[PDB]
Enzyme design. Structure first.
Site, short mmCIF file in Angstrom:
data_model
loop_
_atom_site.label_atom_id
_atom_site.label_comp_id
_atom_site.label_asym_id
_atom_site.label_seq_id
_atom_site.Cartn_x
_atom_site.Cartn_y
_atom_site.Cartn_z
N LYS A 10 -18.49 55.02 -11.49
CA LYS A 10 -17.07 55.30 -11.22
C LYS A 10 -16.73 54.72 -9.84
O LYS A 10 -17.39 55.06 -8.86
CB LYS A 10 -16.82 56.82 -11.27
CG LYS A 10 -15.35 57.23 -11.20
CD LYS A 10 -15.17 58.73 -11.35
CE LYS A 10 -13.69 59.09 -11.31
NZ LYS A 10 -13.46 60.55 -11.47
N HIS B 98 -14.47 67.03 -9.49
CA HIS B 98 -13.86 67.22 -8.17
C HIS B 98 -14.13 68.45 -7.31
O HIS B 98 -13.66 68.50 -6.17
CB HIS B 98 -12.34 67.04 -8.29
CG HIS B 98 -11.93 65.76 -8.95
ND1 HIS B 98 -12.22 64.53 -8.41
CD2 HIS B 98 -11.33 65.52 -10.14
CE1 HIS B 98 -11.82 63.58 -9.24
NE2 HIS B 98 -11.27 64.16 -10.29
N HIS C 243 -6.36 66.76 -13.01
CA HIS C 243 -6.53 65.41 -12.47
C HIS C 243 -6.34 65.43 -10.95
O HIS C 243 -5.49 66.16 -10.45
CB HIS C 243 -5.50 64.47 -13.15
CG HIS C 243 -5.35 63.12 -12.52
ND1 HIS C 243 -6.33 62.16 -12.57
CD2 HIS C 243 -4.31 62.57 -11.84
CE1 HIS C 243 -5.91 61.07 -11.95
NE2 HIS C 243 -4.69 61.29 -11.50
N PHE C 244 -7.15 64.66 -10.23
CA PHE C 244 -7.01 64.54 -8.77
C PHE C 244 -6.22 63.25 -8.60
O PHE C 244 -6.68 62.17 -8.98
CB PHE C 244 -8.39 64.42 -8.10
CG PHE C 244 -8.34 64.55 -6.60
CD1 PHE C 244 -8.46 65.81 -5.99
CD2 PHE C 244 -8.16 63.41 -5.78
CE1 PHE C 244 -8.39 65.95 -4.58
CE2 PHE C 244 -8.08 63.53 -4.37
CZ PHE C 244 -8.19 64.80 -3.77
N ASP C 245 -5.02 63.34 -8.02
CA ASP C 245 -4.19 62.16 -7.86
C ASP C 245 -4.38 61.38 -6.57
O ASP C 245 -4.53 60.15 -6.61
CB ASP C 245 -2.71 62.52 -8.06
CG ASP C 245 -1.90 61.37 -8.64
OD1 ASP C 245 -2.36 60.73 -9.61
OD2 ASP C 245 -0.80 61.11 -8.12
#
Length: 124
Positions: free
Chosen positions: A41, A12, A119-121
């Protein structure tokens, strides 16, 4: 192995650009960051701010994560980001993506000691 914090940085973070380059940005970046190795992905987001600014989000607005956990944080200010999305003509190993630049608030999940993004939400 690779730590969760290091994995966040690889998947990210892209501070090198002020805002994404070409329409070919995601095609090159998703391959370079090893996100098309096992499978293409579906969706991914790259953040163009400094690591310090993104790490600072862990002390910002506490919001609920998409999965229901309580460790998600939203940025108070908008951040320069790039959304990468898989196209229809995209077939593994030749994964094709749509590049979309934007300035939105980011939501990240933070964990550990030090409390860093893992984590990128979402982007709102």
């Amino acid at each position: 192995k690779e730590t969760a914090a290091a994995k966040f940085e690889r998947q990210h973070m892209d501070s090198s650009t002020s805002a994404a380059s070409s329409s070919n940005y995601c095609n090159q970046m998703m391959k370079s960051r090893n996100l098309t190795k096992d499978r293409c992905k579906p969706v991914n987001t790259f953040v163009h701010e400094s690591l310090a600014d993104v790490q600072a989000v862990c002390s910002q607005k506490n919001v609920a994560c998409k999965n229901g956990q309580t460790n998600c944080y939203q940025s108070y200010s908008t951040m320069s980001i790039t959304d990468c999305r898989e196209t229809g003509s995209s077939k593994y190993p030749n994964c094709a993506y749509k590049t979309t630049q934007a300035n939105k608030h980011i939501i990240v999940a933070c964990e550990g000691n030090p409390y860093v993004p893992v984590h990128f939400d979402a982007s709102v």
